[PDB]
């Protein structure tokens, strides 16, 4: 799909990864875990339809987020 | 409320901030902007019932995320 659909998916994948780290550390509440579980299923489906490797998309999302965070300083 | 519930809210605020940076750079697609608008209302309503200042919660979320990212690998 278009460039921005891919970028949006990469960023969403990386932010999911951050949320997962919070949850694994047992630092979130139940609603936060429910959203994590539901978004995981949604991301897997979006990735399938886009043909995208979730692991690589997560790594690309990390670069993009670091990039835009650097630009606001 | 409970500690995990506050922490979840702070993290959600900071991740919304990141997503908003993406949108302000013309880097996201239309569904991503729709989720950003929906989640902004969600953070305002959740924050109001927890009593929390959204700007302070965003700053605290930044600290929490940077901290769990420090000890990743």
Residue numbers in the entry:
A (entry chain B), B (entry chain A): 1 to 73
Give the original sentences from the paper that presented this experimental model.
Encoded by the smallest of the eight viral genome segments, NS1 is a multifunctional RNA-binding protein, which is considered the main weapon of the virus to antagonize the innate immune response of the host and to ensure viral replication in a hostile anti-viral environment. While the effector domain is to some extent dispensable for the biological activities of NS1, the RBD plays an essential role in several activities that require the interaction of NS1 with viral and non-viral RNAs. This is best illustrated by the total loss of pathogenicity conferred by the alanine substitution of Arg38 and Lys41, the two main residues involved in binding of RNAs by NS1.
The X-ray structure of recombinant wild type H7N1 NS1 RBD (residues 1–73) was solved to 1.93 Å resolution. While it is the first structure that is representative of the RBD of allele B-NS1, its organization is identical to that of the other RBD structures available, forming a symmetric C2 homodimer shaped by three interlocking α-helices from each monomer. Helices α1 (residues S3-M24) and α2 (A30 to L50) are oriented in an antiparallel fashion, whereas helix α3 (L54-K70) sits perpendicular to helix α1. The dimerization interface, with an area of 1189Å2, involves 43% of the monomer residues, which are engaged in 15 H-bonds, including 4 salt bridges (PISA server). Three highly conserved residues of α2 helix (F32, R35, and R46) are involved in the stabilization of the dimer, with R35 being engaged in a salt bridge with D12. Invariant residues R35, R37, R38, and K41, which are involved in RNA binding, adopt different conformations when comparing all the apo RBD homodimers. Nonetheless, the RNA binding interface formed by helices α2 and α2* of the homodimer seems to be well preserved on H7N1. This 3D structure also shows several ligands bound to the RBD, originating from the crystallization buffers. Three 1,2-ethanediol and one partial polyethylene glycol molecules have been assigned in a groove formed by helices α3 and α3*. Interestingly, another partial polyethylene glycol molecule is located in a nonpolar pocket found underneath the RNA binding channel at the RBD molecular two-fold axis (between helices α2 and α2*), making an H-bond with the side chain of R46(A).
